Each structure stands twice: as C-alpha cells, then as structure tokens.
Symmetry: C3
Subunit: 731 residues, 3 copies
C-alpha cells in the first residue's frame, strides 16, 4: 500500500562514506553491475570519499571493499568546457549541496552548472546530462588500464569496448564487454592510448584507453546515455542492453529501480521510531541487499547463463560473487535465509558450482578465488540454509564438497580449503608459529566441523556425524586455564611465552584473545564450562562493556554523565564490529541474564549508529555491521548459523512486520517501546506466555506474533531457567 | 589468610607484622620466646600443600637474596614482602636483647635492593642464575608480581623509603617518579571554555588511574613525600583522594581498583595520619578531613587533632603546635598519641614550603 | 652533545648536518678537505668511552647495512640517523667534485630500507644474524629505539620521503598511516550538547596522543603531506597544533612530550615554512600564523610572507603568488628567500584540493 514516505526514501547511500569503507552504490538488489561517482584515482580502493570535492567519473563497479578493490570496471564522465582525457586530469569541482544520492538514482550538479543523473538496472544504466549553455559539450569514456579497448561508431552514436582491469581472482580470458548509445548526434570524437590524444580516430587498444565524444545538444534538451555490459561476450552485452535499457530515459529506469528497492526493503516494515532510526535501519538493510552480487545473465532464449570466474567458460545456471563468507556467514546470509530465501536458493547452488568448476568452495571471492581471511564458512551457508528447509543442492555432493574443504588446501591460496588441516587433524588444534593466525583458524574450524556434523546427522549419516562432532569441542584445546583466555601452542604442545590478552596478530586474526575467546557460538555452555561456570562467564562479559565512571563529578550534572560515556567507549573494551565478538552481547541469553543483553544491545544501537556520512561510529565499524543492526533492531539475532534459532535481544521500534514466503507475516510488537525502556518485562508468543530467550526459525516462518511489554527496569525472573536458554553443543 | 582455617591466598609473612607492630607499641600478651620461635619458623619453612603458609621460596631467598622467577610464582612481590617481614623480626629480636639474631635479620632487610633494575629504574625479576627477565615493561601485570605491576610494587619498601630513594638516585628523582604516579589534569588551551573543562579533565586522568587507589602495595605511597622533603604534596594528594574517590552511597568506593579494602586507610587519613611502617610505632602525617577529631584512648586519655580553619580548599598545613610547642616533624609517635594531648593545625590554601623539609622532620627509614 | 666538552648523550652524527646544511646554503668558512676528513672520520670511528662521540656500531653498519640489536643499544634509531648523515656526506662530497666518495655514501643513504618490516609496515630491529626481533609492537619504547617507538621512528627518513612511501606501498598508504597519527575527535551521537561536546572530545584525543608533538623524530612529520599530494592536510594539522599546544604562559608548551625544545619548530611554522631536510637548501611550505611576516636578510634583502586574509578559521592556502607569478610548489628554496621578495597567499576556510598535487610541486627525495 503506497505511502507518502516510502522505504527507499529512508536510505542514505552516503552512510559510511566519511572518515576514509563505502561508496554510494546505484543499483538494484544483488545487481550484476553497480554504478558510483568516483572521486579517487583509477586504481584506488577509495573510490568515493565524502570529504573529496572533485569528481573524475561515474564508474561501473563491482568492488566489495577498498582492500579487495575492483575488476571489470570502466567509467563515463560528461564534461563542460575543457576536454580532459586521463583520470589524473578529469577533476571537476562539485558541492554536496547539489548532490542527491539514492539507490535508484544519483544526481549531481557541478560548480560549472553541468547536471547529470544516473539510474541503474541489474546490468545496465541510463544517464541524463544537462550541459551548460555556450560551453563545449563532451563525454569521456575511460576503459581503465590493464589492457583495454574502445571502438566508436559515431554515425550510429555507439561506443563499445572491453575492460580487463582486475585485482586477481580471474581466469586468463577475463574481460567485461560494454556498450553504450547516445541520444544526440556525435559531432566529433577521438581516442586516447595513455600517451596521445588522437582526434578523429575511432578504434583504440592499449594498456590504458579512453575516448571522447563531442555533442551539440540544443538549449533545453538533455543528452541521454544508455549503457550495459556483460562478462560473457559483446553479443550478450547487446542482449542485456536491449532487454534492460534500450529506448529508456533516466526517469523510466529510476522509477523501476525505486519500485524494486521498495519491494525488497518492504519485506520488513518498521514502524514507531524516529526518522533517524528509520533512516539507519533502511540504510543498513540496503547495504545488506547488495552483496553477493548476481553474476549470471539471461541469454537470447531467456535462460540463466554465466561466465565462470573459476574456469573461464560459460555455463547454464547461477553464479554469485564479491563476498567473503568469513564476513557474511554471521548475519548477512542468515537474513537472506529468513526474508529473501529465493536468493539463498541460488547462492547455495552457486557455491557447489564454484566447487565443481575449481575443486574448492569459495571463501573470499572477487570474482574468483582471492587470498583473504580464514575459515570454512562456506560450509555455514550451505548448512544454515539446509536446516531452514532451503535445499536446492544435492546432499551427497554438498557433503563431499564440505569434507574436501576440511581435508585439503589450495596449493597457493591459503584461504581456499583448510590451511593447516594436517596439524589440526593430528593435534586437535592448529599450531603457532608454524601456521599464521593458527588460533583464530582453530576456532573457526571447530565451528565448521560442528556444521558438517549437523549436516551429516540430518541426512542419517550417523558415522560421519560422530566423526565431526568429535572435533566440535576442539576450541577447548587452546584455552589456557591459568589465564582464562584462548592462547596458542606450537606443534609440540608448548604454550607461547608471555601471555597477553590484548596482544593483536600472531595466532589471532584482526584481533586479540580478548576478542577471539568468545568465538564459540556453537557451544556457549561449553565455553562457560571452561571459564568456571555461568557466574564467571557473566563477570567476564560484564568487564567488556565498561560503564561510565563519574565518581563525585555528577555534581556538575548529567552533562558530566554524557562526556563520561564517550570516554568509556573511547577506550573500547568491546570493539563493536570486530567479527569474533559480534554475537557476544547475546551470550547473556545463554547464561541466565537476558536483561543484560537487552540493555547493552539498546545502548549500542543508540550510541554507535546514525544515518549520516559517519554513520558507523564504532572505531572498528566500517559498515560490516549493517546486518547485525537490521537483526538487532528487529529484536533477535542468529548467534549460531547452522542452528535454526535466533537469540532474543530487544527491538528498536514499536513494531516490525516481516513479510515471509507463502503470505505469512511475523510481527514483533512492542507498543510501549521507548529510548529509556529497553527491557522486556513480559512476552506473549501467539497469545501464550513466553519466557524463552530464542525463537526458532519455524516459529518465525509459520507467521504470527511476538508481543513484548517493554519496561524501564529489568525483569529478573524472566528467562533465567535452563529451559529458556538457546542451544549449546555441550548441554 | 584464614577463613576459618588456613586458606591458600595471597603472599607474605605479615602475621609477623601484626605481632611486632603490637609489641613495639607495648601490646605484649604473647610469650616472647614463643613468638620469636614462630616468626623464625614462618620464614624457614613452608606448608607442604599451601603456598601462602610459611614462606614460599625460602630456600632460594636465603641462598640468593631474592626469590627467583619463573622458578617461583609472584617471586618479586614475595621478595619485597619478605624483606619487610625479616626487618620486623630484626626489630623484635633487637628489643628482646638478642643482638646476633637481630643482626641476622637486619642483614636481609635490604634484600629489596636485589631486584631493583638500575638501567630501568624499577623493581623487576631474575631467574635462579641471576639473569634479568627479557623485555622490561613497568606496566606488565602478573608473573613476578601479585595483583599489580612493577609500577605498583616498586614502592613496596615501607621500612626503608630513604633506601628506596638511594636506589632511584636521590630524593629528587624519587619525588619526580612519585609525581608521575598522580597524573595532573592537562586541559591545554581549552580552559578557555570554563572551569567545567577543568572538571572533565580530572575524570579522564582518574579514568586513566596511573595511581591505583586500593592497590595494596601503593596504599601508603602518597605518604612518602613526608620522607623526602615535600609534605605539602602528601597533603594535597591525600585530600584530593578523599574528596574524589569516596562517598557514603551504594557505589561509595569509586576507585576502580577499590572494592572496600581501603576503609581503614580512609579512617586514618581523615584523622590526619597513617601507619606507613607497622613495626615502627610512628604515624606519618597527612592532612585531616575535619575541623576536629578526638581520639579516646585507654586510661582516660584523649588526643585531639584540631584544624579549626579546615575547608575543602585548605588542605595544606601552614603551621602546627604539638601540646603548645612548635612542631615541624612529619610524623607522630604512638607514645605521643597514647599519652594524650593536642596537635593544633593551621590550614591554608597554599603550601608552606619551609615546613617539614629538614632531615630531623622525616620519619623512619632503615638506611637513615 | 657538548656541555662544555664532549658529553655522552643521545645519538647520531648530526654534526655533519650543521656543516653540510650551512655549506649548501653558501656558508663556507671552513677548509673543505679538513671538513670532509672530519665527517668521514666521524662515521668510521668512535670514542673509546663515550658512545655518542663518533659512530656507535659503525663496523656492524658498514658490514650489515644496519646497526643490530641487542648488540648495540638503540640500534634502529641510530641506523636511521646514520643513513641521513651519510646522505649529507654524499651531498657534500658531490658538490666538491669528489664523485666516487659521493657515490660510496649515496649507496648508504637508503640503509633505512634494511630495517623496514614489510609484514607490519613499520621500522623494526634485527640482530647481527639478520633475525627480526620477536613480537613486533609498534608502540614499544626503548631497546632498538631512542625516546620513542617504531610509531615515531618510522618517519625518520627526511632525505627520502618518496622512498619511505615506496616502502609503504605508495602515496596512498603513507597518507593513511599519516592520518592515523592525528586521531580526530569522535563524539559519536553526543553532539546534541553542541560545540561543548566537540571541544572536550578534542582534548581527550590529545590526552591520548597518537602524535607526540615535540618528539624529535616526528617533528617534521606534519610537513610530509607536501611530498605525497595533499598539502592541505599539512596546512590543517600545523595550524591546529599551533592553536592548541602552545601559549605564552608559564606552562607554555602543553604537548605532553614538549618541554620547550619545540621553540624553533614554532618560529618556522608560524612563518609558514620548515626545513624538513637540512643539507638540502629547501623549506617545505605549511601555513603561516600571521597576516604578515617580514624576514630581514643579509645585504638589505627582505622576504615577506603575506597572508592578508589569514584568520583562525582560515588555515588553507587557496592560491599563491611568488613575486607576482602563480606558485604551486610546496616548497621555497633558500635562494628564493635569500634574494628577497614576497610570497603572497590567499587564505581560505576550505582546502583547495587542486593545488600542489603534481610531482613538479613536491620537494626533494633521494629516490625521485
């Protein structure tokens, strides 16, 4: 039902774009090609930075992060006045006051008065350009370096080309083939090979190539540019072009993208919250619907096909990419399993496809295998989906791929397969200094093995399930009882010298023992057994969330209370956004104090997020917490993917409605919610008293209502019983 | 540690301190020969099962002059507590007239010197062969130390502050190190936006907590200025701590490391004086909290600390009369309190830098 | 270090820098052969007793390409200082026409590379056998470093900023490492309180100090943005430092690590330029503090830095004329100042991100 302010209207694509990371992607959900303004140099992962004041182009991009960087990329830049060819020299001043960034349309007016907006489809885009009067009118096409080509057909108003730039993870025959068409006659044109501007030349191929077109659009008219591309072939690019953007103007493509975003965003309806909260919520949701990208295309017969970034051939079916599972297994894919399961259907398939095409399941992919991060979290995606009834892959084939991922490793890429599997099988842990990041690896492997065991168990293969369950407690092998933290051992069982809870690097990944000690999401109870019981575990958790200490200064009033909290954060005992601790706040649900979960969660949502350009304020938060926020605001979180349960937190809005498959709807209502009322005093699940600290996937899936009475003080009787705790392997 | 019976907890032979402190104050209800026998056995033996009972690592300590680490857990904190206990036993033996035994134990009183690391300026640790442990770090908790780091334990020399200052290079170096423990608020040029800026700056430091009020090894540390020529500093910091880290509410002990174990420290400090070195019947003078305290002692005697000019912004002692006589010492004897009388203080908002800076004014140190 | 005669203090062969910097600016009052002999000897010998006189660890350094630790105290800071001194000697020999000698010393100028730890992206230390020391820590003071940590010493490559960026992966990573040193206030969502929350937040970051103003090896570091494409960052950070860490009062230098040794840094920065690399007669341009400074130079020449619209909210150089001609270089040569004239600046409250971003605009580096 149409509203005055629609879901997409709340999205700020510039959220996370300052203190630079993020670019303001124009796209449709999971679209094969994204578009973005570019302020950084060609080659820089820092494509758009809020504090930059000079624009160089509008990029077709696939970049999942600055570190990973881009591939298959080219840009279009309209210019007024002086012609500049190289990205080093195309620098056009603009102000954010004349910039309007939305997922369905990006629009900007430069200081010289040139106006341009662009909107994207899955694989194409359309620009409108309004040129300042009495100035020369150009469009420059930059096809990047790495060995590219451009062909202009000026009488047809066409430009085509191929871009091959990449940052690895591509087969030998890699290229993106693109095509574009202009609405007005091309008066003059030329090419550039990185060294010389060649007027009148239509065809160019070199390391770095660009082309210019010169127009004479009459006063009052706008130039339209239509473009599309393909990883398969120039023929397929034209197929994409004709299906998605031929004859369209920007308003048409804008309207369709806008509708697509409202459809997908609207699967969760948040109501009763501030505009700021709504903007934060929907902006995080928008970010969550971008990755992995679809990497398939529809052929002349309308059937899905794809260029495999794993073997370089064209196949029938589905493929996705631009994802590190180490990141996305935790909350992004679980969100898909719940609200967008048709995506998980194709993603899980695509994982087996990559395995069939390369010998291994992907872990970090962009486009193909990339050496990045750790773990076998591809397994988590398959298994989490499976236990939720999403079963599009063949069971035996999936199981074989899982086992192999744990029993082999890519010859040169450490992150592909299981780095250190020999040691881990023999010793029960991965040793350090023999293997980099050994302890974090051990912890991740123990979870993956628990996943495979769960998977085999669900198939009836009890022998194989027992083997893997044997490994699920492997986290115990690295717990140092004297100090009460995870640590590391070498291959002979010797603890490493000079224990230091806060020391980064070495056997840990992007963190210290302070963070990694919590990485046992399949067995919180077992972790508490190591620590001495729920009571010591609670004290240890309590210690991570340092409270403000004002001493006797409160006298100066509550102003004293505010400044104190900054500092307590400003030293950061729990680093919000650090992966291995993202679930940690929910752990109180497992050990009898859910009110603490309720309190800390609502504190974090209020204090470390906003919808502005610095929106992820957590020092360790660069936007990877988007899905964590979406779940947390809804009131629950998938602490342990592979177990179809969501731990209960505390909702941010008075109401959320999840529109699920088969006309089912699940409502979390909290009619008395407010900023000072984070606690759940009482709860009814479909009208019945409800004291569990978790919802099962099936309870959400079948539709219904969780009715919460919110309060300003904790209810210390509720959710304190063993029947109330979610799953642990060692229960 | 006893609850009810022997419990394995913490370190030291501080039972010796209770006995010797009481004895040197005229509290003598135990048999002298039996007490000395028990004290000596406490240093020459250890429970087979419970490390904290008797003296853990006594063999090494006798032989090497320190407890080595990694051979013995918490070895440096143990060495410092032992040297103090042996000093207590020396004092006891000496007052009994047993000079040979006293001399044996006085021999060990300076054992704290054996773990001072000159290149770095702090207590550190050595293994059995005498090698300093690698990677010196003053802030490192654990290992050779107990519930603290060298930063705290370096001050654990109550029976010999003068000696500790010799190790550091003199009164002046020691003063500078003490000063660095109480980080002063730095507000840069923001004072421009009001006194409030000043208040926030103080929270931050405390939140910092370079001096961990309630950490046992440094509980007495604020009083060390009395020993090295600058009692106005003791006066300032003491009053600062009383005002800022205490209140009577449910969160009363605000010190991050303070869970209530400082309540005796507060009682003494509010009265104006503190027993830095039990076993020596003296109390180092601080700065009183109240305009007046009256101690009702045995035999109907009363001792009064009056500070009629006291106020929150007047922590300094400008002048003092003891029983009407001009008084410049930075300590009171137990005898002076016991016998009754009055310490009449004139409080001021600025320090008096002429008062209590002479050697005759300083309290006890073994190497004086 | 001389007080009055040789004193054992600090490190380096910066005696060489004085001689060569003066020489390359045309101050030439000493015999050339004698000076070169003195310089070479200073790097090929060491006083028998005083480690700071001559070159401590010269043998290792000539043999290995670096000074090793733990064999030699403060070995890495020494290495970094020796590399710059060797560059200075090369410059000197070269200007005298002794090209073979110049080449010998130019071969040592890049020795800073021998201690760059690529895995970690910082300077570190190795022993005589080429082993990196265990447990890399960017913030660890002492050992191979002097009065600082790798965090500071990593920037001590004044003669070759370009070479430092290449080690780091390019201009972009160096810029990011540099930005990380000047932590910006983070007020999260507390802004509600207004400018007030903003001010306190800044104070707290400083208290923290990723950048230690006054720490010798990073004194020039803010000027490095001039060498890698973003002079507006230099302008911003210099002006911030001048406004926040200085005043004329008794406290004066509020930088925690500033005890007054930053006086000359302030005079130069206030004038608008700074000698990043003595021995190269150039001054990197920052941002002037005043509306006008007139330098009265020898022979009746006068040089004016004019910034008529300078204001506290206007630290940025929007545009510049040198003697009436458009000027985009991020440095002035000594000859340019010596001959007199004027640098006329248009100040602005926003950065001009087009100015001084080209290779022609950058000052000197050994590796350009």
């Amino acid at each position: 039902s149409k509203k005055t302010v629609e879901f997409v209207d709340y999205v700020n694509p510039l959220m996370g774009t300052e203190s630079t990371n993020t670019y303001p992607a124009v796209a449709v959900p999971w679209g094969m090609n994204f578009w973005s303004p570019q302020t950084g140099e060609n080659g820089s992962g820092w494509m758009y930075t809020y504090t930059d004041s000079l624009m160089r182009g509008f990029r077709q991009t696939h970049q999942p992060s600055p570190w990973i960087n881009d591939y298959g990329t080219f840009s279009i830049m309209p210019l007024a006045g002086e012609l500049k060819m190289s990205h080093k020299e195309r620098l056009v001043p603009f102000s954010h006051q004349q910039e309007k960034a939305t997922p369905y349309n990006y629009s900007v007016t430069f200081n010289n008065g040139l106006q341009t907006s662009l909107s994207a489809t899955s694989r194409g885009a359309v620009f409108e350009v309004s040129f300042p009067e009495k100035e020369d009118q150009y469009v420059v096409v930059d096809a990047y370096n790495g060995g590219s080509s451009i062909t202009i057909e000026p009488e047809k108003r066409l430009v085509k080309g191929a871009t091959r730039y990449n940052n690895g993870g591509v087969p030998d025959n890699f290229a993106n083939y693109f095509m574009m068409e202009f609405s007005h006659p091309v008066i003059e044109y030329g090419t550039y090979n990185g060294d010389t501007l060649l007027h009148h030349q239509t065809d160019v191929a070199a390391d770095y190539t660009c082309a210019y077109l010169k127009f004479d659009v009459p006063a009052g008219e706008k130039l339209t540019i239509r473009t599309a591309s393909s990883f398969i072939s120039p023929e397929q690019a034209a197929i994409n072009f004709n299906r998605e953007v031929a004859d369209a103007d920007v308003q048409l493509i804008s309207g369709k993208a806008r509708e697509q975003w409202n459809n997908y965003l609207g699967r969760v309806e948040a109501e009763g919250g501030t505009d700021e909260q709504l903007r934060t919520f929907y902006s995080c949701l928008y970010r969550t619907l971008l990755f992995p990208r679809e990497f398939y295309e529809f052929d002349s017969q309308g059937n899905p096909v794809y260029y495999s970034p794993y073997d370089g051939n064209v196949h029938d079916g589905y493929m996705y990419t631009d994802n590190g599972f180490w990141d996305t297994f935790r909350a992004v894919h679980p969100l898909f399993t719940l609200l967008y399961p048709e995506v998980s259907e194709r993603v899980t398939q695509s994982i087996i496809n990559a395995y069939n095409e390369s010998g291994f399941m992907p872990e970090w992919a962009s486009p193909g295998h990339r050496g990045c991060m750790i773990g076998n979290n591809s397994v988590s995606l398959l298994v989490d989906a499976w236990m939720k009834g999403i079963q599009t892959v063949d069971a035996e084939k999936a199981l074989e791929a899982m086992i192999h991922q744990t029993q082999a490793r890519h010859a040169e890429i450490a992150s592909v397969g299981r780095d250190g599997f020999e040691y881990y099988d023999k010793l029960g842990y991965v040793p350090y200094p023999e293997v980099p990041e050994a302890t974090a690896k051990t912890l991740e492997y123990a979870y993956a093995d628990w996943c495979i065991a769960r998977f085999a168990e669900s198939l009836g293969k009890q022998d194989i399930a027992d083997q893997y369950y044997q490994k699920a407690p492997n986290y115990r092998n690295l717990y140092y009882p004297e100090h009460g933290f995870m640590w590391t051992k070498d291959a002979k069982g010797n603890w490493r010298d000079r224990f230091d809870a806060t020391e980064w690097g070495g056997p840990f990944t992007e963190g210290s023992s302070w963070h990694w000690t919590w990485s046992v999401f399949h067995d919180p109870e077992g972790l508490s057994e190591l620590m001495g019981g729920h009571e010591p575990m609670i004290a240890r958790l309590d210690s991570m969330f340092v409270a403000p200490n004002t001493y006797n200064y409160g006298t100066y009033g509550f102003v004293i209370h505010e400044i104190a909290e900054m500092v307590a954060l400003n030293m950061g005992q729990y680093a919000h956004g650090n992966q291995p601790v993202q679930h940690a706040i929910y752990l109180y649900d497992y050990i009898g104090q859910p009110w603490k979960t309720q309190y800390h969660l609502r504190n974090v949502m209020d204090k470390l997020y906003n919808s502005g350009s610095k929106g992820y304020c957590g020092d360790e938060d660069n936007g990877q917490t988007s899905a964590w926020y979406v779940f947390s605001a809804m009131g629950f979180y998938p602490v342990c993917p592979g177990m179809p349960e969501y731990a209960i937190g505390s909702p941010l809005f008075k109401k959320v409605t999840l529109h699920l498959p088969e006309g089912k709807n699940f409502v979390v209502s909290a009619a008395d919610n407010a900023a000072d009322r984070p606690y759940i005093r009482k709860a009814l699940l479909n009208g019945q008293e409800f004291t569990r600290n978790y919802l099962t996937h099936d309870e959400l899936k079948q539709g219904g209502e969780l009715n919460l009475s919110m309060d300003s003080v904790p209810n210390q009787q509720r959710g304190t019983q063993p029947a109330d705790f979610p799953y642990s392997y060692s229960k």
